[PDB]
Amino acid sequence: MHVVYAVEEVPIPDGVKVAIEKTGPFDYVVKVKGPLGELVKEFKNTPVIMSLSDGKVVLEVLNAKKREYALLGTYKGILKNMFLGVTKGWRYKLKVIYTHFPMLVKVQGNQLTIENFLGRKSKIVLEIPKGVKVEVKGKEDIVVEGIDRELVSQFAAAIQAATELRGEEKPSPHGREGGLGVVDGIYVVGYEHVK
């Protein structure tokens, strides 16, 4: 359909200061600061008009189609994650599951290393991005923390992907005559806030 005018409002929580800067004809840079840190997000080439009103972020589209109107809900959802990111933080939880070979997960500096995955001599090494903290709880659980939910979720997804074999190395998911097969890996199990 067609939208003459549509508006959305995102209430800024207490202690959070939001700055909106126009870096181009339709580009925006939104800086969000809270007790837990500062996030910076870019909204480039966008039809959404972004503005501040006494403690809210106002999002508007004018003369918009479905494509442009759909971006109001998206930007509201992104901004809400930013506000919760600087007040409560984001924690993604992962579970280590093995069948015969116990995996050894350790964090050394800014490297996350997984050893003995399926008894392989190769070592899975991942680079931990700035703003992400990884802690290994016992032998079964991994926790990824940060203020940028996109950054934190993406890294947690990378850990899970690193243990998913592809091509000729992919094991059969089901066993003989239909039981569970070789299902080893690290699986993202859920998320929650730090506070």
């Binding site: 067609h2 003459v4 005018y5 003369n63």
Partner: protein, 76 residues
């Protein structure tokens, strides 16, 4: 500016009732001819306008028409 309710039907068997905002009935009909011509590949001879009537904004069905009525500015 007024909302015009345009009732019509086409030689291809399609019927329509639409609300178009315009200054005069002539302007509203021009929008109907060009939009229907664009969106359904209908020549002007294939379109038969049966009834044109002003409908007050309070009773209109289209939120597009209502929102245009109260416009204070436009952007290009």
């Amino acid at each position: 500016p007024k909302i015009y309710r345009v009732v019509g039907d086409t030689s291809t068997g399609m019927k329509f009732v639409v609300e178009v905002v315009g200054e005069r009935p002539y302007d509203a009909l021009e929008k109907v001819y060009s939009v229907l011509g664009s969106r359904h590949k209908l020549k002007r001879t294939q379109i038969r306008i049966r009834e044109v009537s002003v409908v007050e904004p309070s009773s209109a069905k289209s939120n597009e028409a209502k929102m245009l009525m109260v416009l204070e500015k436009v952007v290009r």
